Amino acid sequence: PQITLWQRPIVTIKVGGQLKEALLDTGADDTVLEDMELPGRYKPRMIGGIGGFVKVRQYDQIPIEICGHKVIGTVLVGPTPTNIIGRNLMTQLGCTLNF
């Protein structure tokens, strides 16, 4: 894919049979998904943004398909305004920024 930025770079993702929308986000170190149920034991964490910090549950080794491409890695779950794919997963996609 080549994704221009006139619109939000929202892609379709597949999380265990659920399809969702998520923002491809180079400004995010990590992937944060809106509150949902994931497998495994989780570490509560603090994650900070524009408007301060929110608490998230960190889950490891979560299979996600982004854009038809399979990735497996860490996903943070909490009160985010939108699902965001962070660099930890965009590197698995092999995303680069180009200009």
Ligand X SMILES: COc1ccc(S(=O)(=O)N(CC(C)C)C[C@@H](O)[C@H](Cc2ccccc2)NC(=O)O[C@H]2CO[C@H]3O[C@@H]4OCC[C@@H]4[C@H]32)cc1
Binding site for ligand X (CB under 6 A): 23, 25, 27-30, 32, 47-50, 81-82, 84, 86
Minimum CB distance to ligand X, residue 79 (Å) = 10
Restricted to residues 18-37, the positions that interact with a second copy (CB under 8 A) are 23-29, 32
Q: Write the DSSP string, 48-71.
A: EETTEEEEEEEEEEEEEEETTEEE
- Whether 19 contacts 13, CB under 8 Å: yes
Q: How many other CB atoms are there within 10 angstroms of residue 3's CB atom?
A: 13
Restricted to residues 38-97, the positions that interact with a second copy (CB under 8 A) are 47-54, 67, 69, 80-81, 84, 87, 90-91, 93-97
User: CB under 5 to 8 A by kind: which of ligand X, a second copy, none does 91 bind?
Assistant: a second copy
For 73, the 3-state DSSP assignment is strand
In this complex, which beta carbon is closest to a second copy, that of residue 39 or of residue 55? 55
Beta strands at 32-33 and 69-77: parallel, antiparallel or unpaired:
parallel
